[PDB]
Amino acid sequence: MLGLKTSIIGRRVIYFQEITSTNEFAKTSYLEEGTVIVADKQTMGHGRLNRKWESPEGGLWLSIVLSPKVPQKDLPKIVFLGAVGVVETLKEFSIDGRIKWPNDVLVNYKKIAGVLVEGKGDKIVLGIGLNVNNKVPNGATSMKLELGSEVPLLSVFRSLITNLDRLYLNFLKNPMDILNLVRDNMILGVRVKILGDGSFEGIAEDIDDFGRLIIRLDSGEVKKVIYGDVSLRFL
């Protein structure tokens, strides 16, 4: 009854009033590619590492099941599909979102969405959390806060699924295309701090052909950061 016209992503959609985590459900259950897992709220929303993702009602919390027949080298770009897709849907709603490497979407520097990719077996789970009408943690923002009025969640859902379906289909044919869209939509030419041990600081110059953030330290040294137990903070 949703009448989705997408080719792959959205062929099936499993909705929950409540759930622990759409990402967890997605990787522990057998699902055909393109299946979307979505819930009104998550009791155990997951961020990177052991971080929690606040998932109260009013937001868009979903996971998509993928099984891309592309070289292993390209898989790390899946997170960018989610991020660019969010940016595209925000634009449709007249909101300018900017990507903060490697998985965040910011609006005027406030986090409005986060992307979490997990790969179990030949299956890949693309998780996306977008604040729409829900209240958010201090420092974050939502579509409702940016526009001044509630946005129909289903309208956002349809827009995002349509955008992701297109990005994904192109990704399967032209896997390097997404990087271009990312460069044109991410925060660069600014100073950042790379936490963790070996912690350093420098200017985020660009992302390379593998999706690595290229940083120029004050000494002129160039480091290439791969995203994992990695965290980027502005300063």
Ligand X SMILES: Nc1ncnc2c1ncn2[C@@H]1O[C@H](COP(=O)(O)OC(=O)CCCC[C@@H]2SC[C@@H]3NC(=O)N[C@@H]32)[C@@H](O)[C@H]1O
Lookup result for tokens 């996306």: 128
**What strand order describes the sheet that includes 222-225?**
222-225, 213-216, 200-207, 190-194, 232-234
Judged by CB under 6 A, does residue 144 bind ligand X?
Answer: no
Judged by CB under 5 A, does residue 23 bind Mg ion?
Answer: no
Interatomic CA distance for residues 183 and 90, integer angstroms: 17
- Rounded least distance, CB 16 to its own copies, Å: 5
Interatomic CA distance for residues 1 and 90, integer angstroms: 25
- Rounded least distance, CB 187 to Mg ion, Å: 12
157 binds, among Mg ion, ligand X, its own copies, none (CB under 5 to 8 A by kind): its own copies
Q: How many residues sit close enough to ligand X to count as binding (CB under 6 A)?
A: 28
Which residue of 58, 129, 202, 211 would you call a contact of ligand X, by CB under 6 A?
129
The annotated binding site for ADP is made up of 48-49, 51, 53-54, 103, 111, 131, 233
Judged by CB under 5 A, does residue 86 bind Mg ion?
Answer: no
Question: With respect to ligand X, which residue has the nearer C-beta, 195 or 222?
Answer: 195
Interatomic CA distance for residues 159 and 165, integer angstroms: 10
Judged by CB under 6 A, does residue 51 bind ligand X?
Answer: yes
Query: DSSP string of 113-160?
Result: EEEEEEEETTEEEEEEEE-SSS---TTB--HHHHHSS---HHHHHHHH
The annotated binding site for adenosine is made up of 53-54, 111, 131
Q: What is the identity of the amino acid at 105?
A: V
Interatomic CA distance for residues 178 and 4, integer angstroms: 24
Question: With respect to its own copies, which residue has the nearer C-beta, 60 or 136?
Answer: 60
- Rounded least distance, CB 184 to its own copies, Å: 28
The annotated binding site for Mg(2+) is made up of 103-104
Judged by CB under 6 A, does residue 163 bind ligand X?
Answer: no
159 binds, among ligand X, Mg ion, its own copies, none (CB under 5 to 8 A by kind): none
Angle between helices 78-92 and 153-173 (to 10 degrees): 140
The residue with its CB nearest to Mg ion is 104
Chain positions contacting its own copies, by CB under 8 A:
1-6, 10-18, 38-40, 57, 60-62, 153-154, 156-157
DSSP state of 76: G
Closest of 61, 35, 52 to residue 123, by C-alpha = 35
The annotated binding site for Mn(2+) is made up of 103-104
